[PDB]
Amino acid sequence: PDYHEDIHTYLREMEVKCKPKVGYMKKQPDITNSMRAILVDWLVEVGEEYKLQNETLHLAVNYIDRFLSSMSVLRGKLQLVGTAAMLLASKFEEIYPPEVAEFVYITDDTYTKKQVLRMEHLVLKVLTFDLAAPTVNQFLTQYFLHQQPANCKVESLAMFLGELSLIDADPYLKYLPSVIAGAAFHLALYTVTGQSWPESLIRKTGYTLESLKPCLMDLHQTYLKAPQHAQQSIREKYKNSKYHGVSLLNPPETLNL
Amino acid sequence: SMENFQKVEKIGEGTYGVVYKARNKLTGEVVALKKIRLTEGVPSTAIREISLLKELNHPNIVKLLDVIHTENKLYLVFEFLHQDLKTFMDASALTGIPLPLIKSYLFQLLQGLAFCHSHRVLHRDLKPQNLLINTEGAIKLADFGLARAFGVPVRTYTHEVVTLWYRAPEILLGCKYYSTAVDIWSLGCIFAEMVTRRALFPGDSEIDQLFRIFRTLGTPDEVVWPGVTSMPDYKPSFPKWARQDFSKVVPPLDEDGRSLLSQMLHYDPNKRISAKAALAHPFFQDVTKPVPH
Numbered sequence: 001p002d003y004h005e006d007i008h009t010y011l012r013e014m015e016v017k018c019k020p021k022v023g024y025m026k027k028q029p030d031i032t033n034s035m036r037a038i039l040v041d042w043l044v045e046v047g048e049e050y051k052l053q054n055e056t057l058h059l060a061v062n063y064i065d066r067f068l069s070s071m072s073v074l075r076g077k078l079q080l081v082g083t084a085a086m087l088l089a090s091k092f093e094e095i096y097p098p099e100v101a102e103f104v105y106i107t108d109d110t111y112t113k114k115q116v117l118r119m120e121h122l123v124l125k126v127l128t129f130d131l132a133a134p135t136v137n138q139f140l141t142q143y144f145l146h147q148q149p150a151n152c153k154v155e156s157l158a159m160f161l162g163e164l165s166l167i168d169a170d171p172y173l174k175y176l177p178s179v180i181a182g183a184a185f186h187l188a189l190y191t192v193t194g195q196s197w198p199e200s201l202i203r204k205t206g207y208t209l210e211s212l213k214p215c216l217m218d219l220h221q222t223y224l225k226a227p228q229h230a231q232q233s234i235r236e237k238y239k240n241s242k243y244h245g246v247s248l249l250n251p252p253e254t255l256n257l
Numbered sequence: 258s259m260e261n262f263q264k265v266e267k268i269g270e271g272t273y274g275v276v277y278k279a280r281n282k283l284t285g286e287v288v289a290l291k292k293i294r295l296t297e298g299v300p301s302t303a304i305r306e307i308s309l310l311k312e313l314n315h316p317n318i319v320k321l322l323d324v325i326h327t328e329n330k331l332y333l334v335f336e337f338l339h340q341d342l343k344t345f346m347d348a349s350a351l352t353g354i355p356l357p358l359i360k361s362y363l364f365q366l367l368q369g370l371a372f373c374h375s376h377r378v379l380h381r382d383l384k385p386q387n388l389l390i391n392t393e394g395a396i397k398l399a400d401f402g403l404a405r406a407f408g409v410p411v412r413t414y415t416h417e418v419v420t421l422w423y424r425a426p427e428i429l430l431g432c433k434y435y436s437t438a439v440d441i442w443s444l445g446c447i448f449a450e451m452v453t454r455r456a457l458f459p460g461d462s463e464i465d466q467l468f469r470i471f472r473t474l475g476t477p478d479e480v481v482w483p484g485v486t487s488m489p490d491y492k493p494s495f496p497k498w499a500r501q502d503f504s505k506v507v508p509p510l511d512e513d514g515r516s517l518l519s520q521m522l523h524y525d526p527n528k529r530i531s532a533k534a535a536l537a538h539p540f541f542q543d544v545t546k547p548v549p550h
């Protein structure tokens with residue numbers, strides 16, 4: 001607890017400032033939620049192939065949603081936007097980012113290196129170099145410190161749920177990272193241990209089950225329908241022993257809220 | 258874009274890129290301009306520096322004023338401070354620095370650094386060359402090219418971190434997690450150095466560095482630093498030196514000064530004093546803001 005609380009407080013303020021605009025997709029003349037779902041799911045694959053941090057994936061997705069909040073993009077250029085965003089998030093967050101050729105290569109030469117680098121400067125310009133956005137992952141990690149005791153299945157499952165919410169702009173563009181992380185932590189905790197969102201996290205965050213319910217009802221249906229969703233790279237990723245096989249766990253039939 | 262700046266003179270060379278003193282021809286304002294020739298796109302050091310300085314508005318953190326961003330070059334426009342602490346310390350050879358200035362400087366650095374740690378930023382390169390001073394008596398943290406945004410709790414970040422002389426023993430012993438404590442350590446070494454005007458642990462290598470720290474503070478065991486003997490780069494053949502009487506470490510220092518430096522140079526990162534908690538130390542009970550010479 002040196003600065004854990006100054007930091008939570010700051011991340012709460014910055015998450016409001018860093019928020020994508022909830023309705024941007026209707027204003028997009030050419031792309032859909034489904035297309036964004038495809039692009040996120042590819043980004044998950046890419047993070048797996050290059051062994052990138054979960055944080056780096058959450059960051060890039062933030063960069064994309066905020067970029068698409070002010071910038072109209074044709075469907076054949078969406079992958080370019082997502083490539084630059086993942087390259088930028090790697091530079092921000094990784095000890096060893098992949099090099100720019102590695103990013104060109106995985107588009108399957110859809111784009112040149114010049115295009116990827118020109119897109120990078122453009123994304124920087126639109127985001128005004130504001131790259132230290134709060135993420136669901138950053139909130140979860142603080143919430144984990146409130147477990148009694150720590151439970152790796154609970155952590156990996158909360159990460160798995162928080163990650164699935166990246167895929168589906170409807171409904172998750174409408175929730176803040178701290179709230180999604182709230183739902184995710186509780187739903188993880190309940191599925192594995194039977195326990196609920198602790199009182200100590202009510203004290204810390206001011207959120208209760210009641211305030212979490214709307215996000216939580218959505219997240220529950222995502223978890224239930226996960227095996228049938230068109231996008232499946234988070235499910236496969238989280239079958240790995242690194243995340244304790246949690247995508248293999250059974251969702252609870254009801255939450256008793 | 259650079260149409261309104263007139264170059265005055267080159268300052269030197271940063272973590273990356275080249276720094277000139279310039280003035281705004283319309284406002285009169287004096288600036289430091291870091292030029293970045295733009296490969297692999299925008300350097301990760303420049304991306305981190307810009308995002309993190311834009312978040313950090315504090316009297317004791319250098320102001321990034323603007324980013325001028327062309328397909329060719331990227332310029333960072335900083336407010337200009339008259340010198341760094343290193344040049345000041347060299348100039349104070351024969352005077353030495355008055356206690357009231359040392360105290361005021363440390364108080365200020367601990368203010369800049371607390372603000373950084375509150376805003377989840379590690380500086381990771383505190384040294385006198387990165388600490389800038391004006392004529393009114395302010396000192397400010399600069400060069401956020403090695404800085405990073407951290408999580409709670411920390412993950413493993415870059416090992417290859419901190420100019421060697423200012424580098425914390427948890428970095429040198431290869432701990433998989435370091436945190437805010439590595440910047441307190443560096444400020445310990447600099448507090449010591451403002452008082453003696455030489456570096457406290459001028460090692461030439463990682464092992465030379467550790468041994469110097471050990472001869473001053475004692476080789477740490479499991480009583481002083483639970484977990485040391487399990488750290489990756491701990492070796493049980495380490496010579497075991499006695500801890501020195503702390504009044505010997507920096508002899509001009511009074512009791513409260515020693516107490517403070519001792520808490521900053523605590524081995525165990527977890528027991529090392531925070532920048533926040535150090536602001537309230539009795540050392541600072543009479544603190545003022547004198548101008549320097």
Ligand SMILES: Cc1ccc(Cl)c(N(CC#N)c2cc(Nc3ccc(OC[C@H](O)CN(C)C)cc3)ncn2)c1
Nearest residue numbers: 268269270271276289336337338339340341387399400
């Ligand atoms: C390059 C260099 C190194 C470290 C830094 Cl933080 C900076 N930056 C950019 C940032 N952030 C400055 C410098 C400055 N003023 C100054 C700094 C040193 C200095 O040193 C004088 C001597 O010439 C040093 N020497 C003997 C080698 C003179 C003026 N004011 C504002 N920003 C530039």
Ligand SMILES: [Mg+2]
Nearest residue numbers: 025026028031
């Ligand atoms: Mg549309």
